[PDB]
């Protein structure tokens, strides 16, 4: 299922536990950006997905502050888990940096990350 | 913290009750005015618990999976934004709403938008 | 058409002069108030030239590459939105700004935002 | 270069001409959605990209109306062209449908398309 260790196309590591009632909890390590070591993540997922072959909707957040660095930014990933032989989490994400009100127009990056359980 | 903690409404008439923990945790409950949903949903998120003191906003994000004891939309929204404090406190966000889809329909699985939250006294 | 055609400003103070052609073409010129840019830039786009008469907006989009005779930011913005006609005409958009990057930096190549355009008499 | 026939991961066909001064002009055929046959596209690209190995920024629009169908919607793709042995156009896109003002909150889909010159 969702619980396990995942890796995206950047080489980032996503270690997540899926709770019975819809909680996502875990640890993120990014291969890129103003960051080092582990960061706390929390999110939610659909704990009773539809039985028609549809993916499982989910989302999580990392605020990019830990004991080593603070980038003054946070990323949310929104996506779906697709099970089967080669499980995937396909996401699109938003990274917002803290900015002045005048710089808010350029505060948010958008991207997409695909996660698999295969180590780089 | 006490700044983020409280009751917020957005331009749709949705309501967001949140507690900002000392460790960077956001926890609480969301009621949407719109969509395939009713009653309260669990929210969880993170925020920068040591922001820049330079008049920059405080980065944060949270997610809601649209399943509670009453309804399941098979979808989830993440909001990514910043808290701007002061007398007229705001949380300015962009969001992604992803629905569970079949592989054939995954290309149209995700909506994008923007919500502005005003804190309620 | 004559509805879309004209001069528009957004909440940044940017200006958008456009002509909507009978064939669905949008053509004109954009001045941004912000970013790595100055003077006028070429815009080109498309719009639904036979929209629903049901009080739905008119879907459209346009792009600007931020290169003119004066400056090159090595970037381009696309706006995707709808025109809402009437006495207080608006074009409501979401946009993506992509900068040319090296492969190592492609993950942070794209900004997202939202602009509201008001038509000027 | 950019001029040529491209295909994305959905099987859509993108036939584009890149003009000397930054114009993109061409024809789009989609493998998915409320659409059939060719649609007109126009866009722009950076006609003097940086000489440091960076991709070429670009964007284009299709309004999903032709002689066969009208979906009352338009898509913009924003991205960069990456040249070399296996050229790519990597994009993220926004699809806005015409809606009432009250339904505007759910009017815009976001996604990502990767284009190559390889026929399906
Ligand atoms: C979202 C992207 N995917 C990923 O695995 N890491 C990127 C995010 C890194 C951000 C680091 C904090 C910063 O530079 O602001
Ligand atoms: C993100 C939008 N802002 C908001 O307050 N609610 C909208 C989301 C509602 C979605 C309800 C479940 C569904 O329809 O999929
Ligand atoms: C899309 C935003 N809205 C707007 O009027 N201009 C902004 C874009 C300006 C970008 C200028 C070139 C650059 O900085 O890359
Ligand atoms: C952007 C997606 N990529 C693609 O090649 N086609 C999709 C768009 C199809 C939209 C068809 C019109 C509609 O259904 O509204």
Coordinates of N, CA and C in Angstrom, one line a residue, chain A residues 40 42-50 54-55 57-61 63 65 70 72-74 76-80 82 92-94 96-101 107-108, chain B residues 42 44-52 55-57 59 61-63 65 67 72 74-76 78-82 84 94-96 98-103 109-110:
Chain A
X40 N 9.9 16.8 8.8 CA 8.6 16.2 9.2 C 7.6 16.5 8.1
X42 N 3.3 15.8 7.2 CA 2.0 15.3 7.5 C 1.0 15.5 6.4
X43 N 0.1 14.6 6.3 CA -1.0 14.7 5.3 C -2.2 13.9 5.5
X44 N -3.0 13.7 4.5 CA -4.2 12.9 4.5 C -4.4 12.1 3.3
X45 N -5.1 11.0 3.3 CA -5.4 10.2 2.1 C -6.8 9.6 2.3
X46 N -7.4 9.2 1.1 CA -8.7 8.6 1.1 C -8.6 7.2 1.6
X47 N -9.1 6.9 2.8 CA -8.9 5.6 3.5 C -10.0 4.6 3.1
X48 N -10.9 5.0 2.2 CA -11.8 4.0 1.5 C -12.0 4.4 0.0
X49 N -10.9 4.1 -0.8 CA -11.1 4.6 -2.2 C -12.2 3.8 -2.9
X50 N -12.6 4.3 -4.1 CA -13.6 3.6 -4.9 C -13.2 2.2 -5.4
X54 N -10.0 3.1 -9.6 CA -9.5 4.4 -9.5 C -8.4 4.5 -8.4
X55 N -7.5 5.4 -8.6 CA -6.4 5.7 -7.7 C -6.9 6.3 -6.4
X57 N -6.7 9.2 -3.8 CA -6.4 10.6 -3.6 C -5.7 10.8 -2.2
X58 N -4.7 11.7 -2.3 CA -3.9 12.0 -1.1 C -3.2 13.3 -1.3
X59 N -2.6 13.8 -0.1 CA -1.8 15.0 -0.2 C -1.0 15.1 1.1
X60 N 0.2 15.8 1.0 CA 0.9 16.1 2.2 C 1.7 17.3 2.2
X61 N 2.2 17.8 3.3 CA 3.0 19.0 3.4 C 4.3 18.8 4.1
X63 N 7.1 21.6 5.7 CA 7.7 22.9 6.0 C 9.2 22.7 6.1
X65 N 11.9 23.4 7.4 CA 12.6 23.8 8.6 C 12.9 22.5 9.4
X70 N 16.6 26.3 7.7 CA 15.2 26.9 7.5 C 15.2 27.7 6.3
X72 N 12.4 28.8 5.0 CA 11.3 29.7 5.1 C 10.3 29.5 3.9
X73 N 9.9 28.2 3.8 CA 9.1 27.8 2.6 C 8.4 26.5 3.0
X74 N 7.4 26.1 2.3 CA 6.7 24.9 2.5 C 6.2 24.3 1.1
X76 N 3.4 21.6 -0.7 CA 2.3 20.6 -0.6 C 2.3 19.8 -1.9
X77 N 2.2 18.5 -1.7 CA 2.0 17.6 -2.9 C 0.6 17.1 -2.9
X78 N -0.1 17.1 -4.0 CA -1.4 16.6 -4.2 C -1.4 15.6 -5.3
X79 N -2.0 14.4 -5.1 CA -2.0 13.4 -6.0 C -2.8 12.2 -5.7
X80 N -2.5 11.1 -6.4 CA -3.1 9.8 -6.1 C -2.1 8.6 -6.1
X82 N -1.5 4.8 -7.0 CA -1.9 3.8 -8.0 C -1.2 2.5 -7.6
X92 N 1.3 16.5 -8.2 CA 1.7 17.8 -8.6 C 1.9 18.5 -7.3
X93 N 2.8 19.5 -7.3 CA 3.1 20.2 -6.0 C 3.1 21.7 -6.1
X94 N 3.0 22.3 -5.0 CA 3.1 23.8 -4.9 C 4.2 24.1 -3.8
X96 N 5.5 27.2 -1.7 CA 5.4 28.6 -1.4 C 6.5 29.1 -0.5
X97 N 7.2 30.1 -0.9 CA 8.2 30.7 0.0 C 7.6 31.9 0.8
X98 N 8.0 32.2 2.0 CA 7.6 33.4 2.7 C 8.2 34.6 2.0
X99 N 7.4 35.6 1.6 CA 7.8 36.8 0.9 C 7.1 38.0 1.5
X100 N 7.6 39.2 1.1 CA 6.9 40.4 1.4 C 5.6 40.4 0.6
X101 N 4.6 41.2 1.0 CA 3.3 41.2 0.3 C 3.5 41.7 -1.2
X107 N 5.8 34.1 -5.4 CA 6.1 33.3 -4.2 C 6.0 31.8 -4.3
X108 N 5.3 31.4 -5.4 CA 4.8 30.0 -5.5 C 5.3 29.3 -6.8
Chain B
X42 N -11.2 16.5 8.7 CA -9.9 16.6 9.4 C -8.9 17.4 8.4
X44 N -4.7 18.5 8.3 CA -3.3 18.4 8.9 C -2.3 19.1 8.0
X45 N -1.4 19.8 8.6 CA -0.4 20.6 7.8 C 0.9 20.9 8.6
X46 N 1.7 21.7 8.1 CA 2.9 22.2 8.7 C 3.1 23.7 8.4
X47 N 3.8 24.4 9.2 CA 4.1 25.7 9.0 C 5.6 26.0 9.5
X48 N 6.1 27.1 8.9 CA 7.5 27.5 9.4 C 7.3 28.1 10.8
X49 N 7.8 27.4 11.8 CA 7.7 27.9 13.2 C 8.7 28.9 13.6
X50 N 9.7 29.2 12.8 CA 10.7 30.2 13.0 C 10.8 31.1 11.8
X51 N 9.8 31.9 11.4 CA 9.9 32.6 10.1 C 10.9 33.8 10.2
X52 N 11.1 34.4 9.1 CA 11.9 35.6 9.0 C 11.2 36.8 9.7
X55 N 9.2 41.1 7.9 CA 8.0 41.5 7.2 C 7.7 40.5 6.0
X56 N 8.4 39.4 6.0 CA 8.0 38.3 5.1 C 6.8 37.5 5.7
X57 N 6.0 36.9 4.9 CA 4.9 36.0 5.4 C 5.5 34.7 6.0
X59 N 5.4 30.8 5.7 CA 5.0 29.7 4.8 C 4.3 28.6 5.5
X61 N 1.3 25.0 4.8 CA 0.4 24.2 3.9 C -0.4 23.3 4.7
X62 N -1.5 22.8 4.2 CA -2.3 21.8 4.8 C -3.0 21.0 3.8
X63 N -3.5 19.8 4.2 CA -4.3 19.0 3.3 C -5.6 18.5 4.0
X65 N -8.4 15.4 3.1 CA -9.0 14.4 2.3 C -10.5 14.4 2.5
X67 N -13.0 12.8 3.0 CA -13.8 11.7 3.6 C -13.9 12.0 5.1
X72 N -17.8 10.6 1.2 CA -16.5 10.4 0.7 C -16.5 10.8 -0.8
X74 N -13.8 10.9 -2.6 CA -12.6 10.3 -3.3 C -11.7 11.3 -3.9
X75 N -11.3 12.3 -3.1 CA -10.5 13.5 -3.5 C -9.8 14.1 -2.3
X76 N -8.9 15.0 -2.6 CA -8.1 15.6 -1.5 C -7.6 16.9 -2.0
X78 N -4.8 20.1 -1.3 CA -3.7 20.7 -0.5 C -3.7 22.2 -0.8
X79 N -3.5 23.0 0.3 CA -3.4 24.4 0.2 C -1.9 24.8 0.5
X80 N -1.3 25.6 -0.3 CA 0.0 26.0 -0.1 C 0.0 27.6 0.0
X81 N 0.6 28.2 1.0 CA 0.5 29.6 1.1 C 1.3 30.3 2.2
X82 N 0.9 31.5 2.5 CA 1.6 32.2 3.6 C 0.6 32.9 4.4
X84 N 0.0 36.1 6.7 CA 0.4 37.5 6.9 C -0.3 38.0 8.1
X94 N -2.6 29.1 -2.7 CA -3.0 28.4 -4.0 C -3.2 27.0 -3.6
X95 N -4.1 26.3 -4.3 CA -4.5 24.9 -4.0 C -4.6 24.0 -5.1
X96 N -4.4 22.7 -4.8 CA -4.6 21.6 -5.8 C -5.6 20.7 -5.2
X98 N -7.0 17.0 -6.1 CA -6.9 15.8 -6.9 C -8.0 14.8 -6.6
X99 N -8.7 14.3 -7.6 CA -9.7 13.3 -7.4 C -9.0 11.9 -7.8
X100 N -9.4 10.9 -7.1 CA -9.0 9.5 -7.5 C -9.7 9.3 -8.9
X101 N -8.9 8.8 -9.9 CA -9.3 8.5 -11.2 C -8.8 7.2 -11.7
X102 N -9.4 6.7 -12.8 CA -8.8 5.5 -13.5 C -7.6 6.1 -14.3
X103 N -6.7 5.2 -14.7 CA -5.5 5.6 -15.4 C -5.8 6.4 -16.7
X109 N -7.4 14.7 -13.5 CA -7.6 14.4 -12.1 C -7.5 15.6 -11.2
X110 N -6.9 16.7 -11.6 CA -6.5 17.8 -10.7 C -6.9 19.2 -11.1

